[PDB]
Amino acid sequence: ESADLRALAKHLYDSYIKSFPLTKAKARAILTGKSPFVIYDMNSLMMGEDKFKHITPLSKEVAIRIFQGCQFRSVEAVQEITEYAKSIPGFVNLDLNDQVTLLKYGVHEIIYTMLASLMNKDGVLISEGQGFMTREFLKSLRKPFGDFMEPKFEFAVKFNALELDDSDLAIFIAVIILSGDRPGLLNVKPIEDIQDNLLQALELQLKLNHPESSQLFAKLLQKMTDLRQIVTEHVQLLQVIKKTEMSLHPLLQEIYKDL
Amino acid sequence: MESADLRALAKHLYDSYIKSFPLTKAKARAILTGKTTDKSPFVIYDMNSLMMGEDKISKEVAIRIFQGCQFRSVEAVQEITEYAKSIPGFVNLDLNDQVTLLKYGVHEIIYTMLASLMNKDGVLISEGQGFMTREFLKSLRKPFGDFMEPKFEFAVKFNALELDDSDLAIFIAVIILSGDRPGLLNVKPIEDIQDNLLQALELQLKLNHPESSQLFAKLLQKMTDLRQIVTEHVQLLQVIKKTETDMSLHPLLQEIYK
Numbered sequence A: 001e002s003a004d005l006r007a008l009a010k011h012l013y014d015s016y017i018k019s020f021p022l023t024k025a026k027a028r029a030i031l032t033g034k035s036p037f038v039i040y041d042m043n044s045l046m047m048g049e050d051k052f053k054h055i056t057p058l059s060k061e062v063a064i065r066i067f068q069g070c071q072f073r074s075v076e077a078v079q080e081i082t083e084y085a086k087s088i089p090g091f092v093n094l095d096l097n098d099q100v101t102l103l104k105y106g107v108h109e110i111i112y113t114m115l116a117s118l119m120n121k122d123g124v125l126i127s128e129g130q131g132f133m134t135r136e137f138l139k140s141l142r143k144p145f146g147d148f149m150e151p152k153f154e155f156a157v158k159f160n161a162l163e164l165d166d167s168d169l170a171i172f173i174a175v176i177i178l179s180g181d182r183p184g185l186l187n188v189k190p191i192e193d194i195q196d197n198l199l200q201a202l203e204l205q206l207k208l209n210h211p212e213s214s215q216l217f218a219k220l221l222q223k224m225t226d227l228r229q230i231v232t233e234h235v236q237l238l239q240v241i242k243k244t245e246m247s248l249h250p251l252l253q254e255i256y257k258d259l
Numbered sequence B: 001m002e003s004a005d006l007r008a009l010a011k012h013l014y015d016s017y018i019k020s021f022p023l024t025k026a027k028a029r030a031i032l033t034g035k036t037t038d039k040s041p042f043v044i045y046d047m048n049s050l051m052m053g054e055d056k057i058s059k060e061v062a063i064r065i066f067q068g069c070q071f072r073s074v075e076a077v078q079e080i081t082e083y084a085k086s087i088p089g090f091v092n093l094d095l096n097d098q099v100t101l102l103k104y105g106v107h108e109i110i111y112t113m114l115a116s117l118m119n120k121d122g123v124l125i126s127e128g129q130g131f132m133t134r135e136f137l138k139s140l141r142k143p144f145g146d147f148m149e150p151k152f153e154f155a156v157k158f159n160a161l162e163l164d165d166s167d168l169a170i171f172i173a174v175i176i177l178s179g180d181r182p183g184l185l186n187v188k189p190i191e192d193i194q195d196n197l198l199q200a201l202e203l204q205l206k207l208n209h210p211e212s213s214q215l216f217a218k219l220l221q222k223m224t225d226l227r228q229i230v231t232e233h234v235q236l237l238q239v240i241k242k243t244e245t246d247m248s249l250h251p252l253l254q255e256i257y258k
């Protein structure tokens, strides 16, 4: 019934708000000016990290230091997504191996999605919106690091034209997690039953929240196409970096072994 | 914190412990105490049964066994690292401090969780498919025999507390989040997390062992015995390393011991 779907939408929105540091609503206010430190070149990076816990010297080259800052922030997001997943109705009741599998194969798609909340066409928010690193600075990093950053902005600009808000994104993120086609799942049926409920709720939410945005539901599901592919391209970009170039303390490499 | 937050944290950490560590104490105790047909381990107690064990479960035997321990210890480090990431606040810390905490914490945790696999007569191996007797390990030559036995000496005492996995999940989280590790940059955010974990441990032990008086203090005192056993272990491993050439250390362990 509608009430159950709206109750589920509100449940997920409230947990979404508690799980993530910077919401899209707050991020947009920063990006539009409605005041962060701007990193637009090398000198302003040095000042920005002398006046950001991901790009502090622990690798001396700047492009490497920014690249690992991306990894180290992605590890934080994984734990934030993991906590959020526990709030999705039915999730903690799934087989424990399947919970791990769902999170393992989903965090990459979800981090891409949620990164778009922090991006516009000119750059990206960092350190809870306290900093803003320009697209041009990231795109102009040397060797493959510059071509590693730009595809994220390319996706975000297109994803952002849907103009989803946080209440829409809370259900969408839950739909991605509850994907019954992840390899190695042991009991697909209850995962698909939950996702079917989340899809009903997302569908009703987009009708109520975007009544004049025709077939928005379909277009969001199509962005599942854009997401599986770029995560595919993303892993193959990492592999080229790993064989060509990065040394970290073996313990450090263990913390990041998944990203 | 309020009780409900203390209990919610204990449940979180237990869930994650189960996801992170393939062989729980609950399963280890089922194997060790037996009474079953399907879970029965093959028992390695001498040279011939080790050979038969490696057919259903080359260097000198003591080196082979040491490499056995070394290989599991690296896997354990990997499992502990994964578990640490799930502790609320740990990944948000300064990354040098994350390294520093794992660096000094893993050995104390390995000893703790090794006890789960031990009784006074031996230790489970190959994910519980095998059991290697204490006497066999202790009779290995040169320095390798006395290198094995102190682990059993601690475990017999630690196991007298009768902790279960839900207790141990919080206890090993307290160990990791120790503010007195050398070289830490930001002691205060680590201590705030530990105080939360210590509160959680205290309530967990009172609810789970309500007839066990001062179990909390006794467990914290065991975090003393661990500081010493880890000291003796590394001082034995260094001496072993500069007398035995037939051992390389895994690069992960080599960097931890530096």
Ligand SMILES: C[C@@H](Oc1cc(C(=O)O)ccc1-c1nn(C(=O)c2c(Cl)cccc2C(F)(F)F)c2ccc(Cl)cc12)c1ccccc1
Binding pocket: A054, A055, A066, A067, A068, A069, A070, A071, A072, A073, A074, A075, A077, A107, A108, A111, A112, A114, A115, A118, A124, A125, A126, A133, A138, A148, A149, A152, A259
């Ligand atoms: C702005 C900040 O980055 C993020 C912040 C957040 C957040 O706050 O929610 C989420 C993601 C990134 C970020 N990940 N990422 C990756 O490569 C990546 C991705 Cl998409 C998915 C999974 C794993 C990874 C990997 F493991 F490989 F890291 C980026 C690539 C380019 C850009 Cl511009 C941002 C990201 C940051 C910190 C430090 C320097 C620069 C930018």
Ligand SMILES: C[C@@H](Oc1cc(C(=O)O)ccc1-c1nn(C(=O)c2c(Cl)cccc2C(F)(F)F)c2ccc(Cl)cc12)c1ccccc1
Binding pocket: B065, B066, B067, B068, B069, B070, B071, B072, B073, B076, B107, B110, B111, B113, B114, B117, B123, B124, B125, B126, B132, B137, B147, B148, B151, B237, B253
């Ligand atoms: C039962 C199995 O050993 C462990 C299994 C596990 C596990 O499954 O969680 C964790 C630890 C050991 C184990 N490490 N270890 C060491 O010396 C050691 C330690 Cl504690 C910490 C860091 C580095 C090392 C070193 F590098 F030096 F190796 C042992 C010494 C004696 C005993 Cl009886 C067990 C261990 C095993 C496998 C194969 C043959 C015999 C025993």
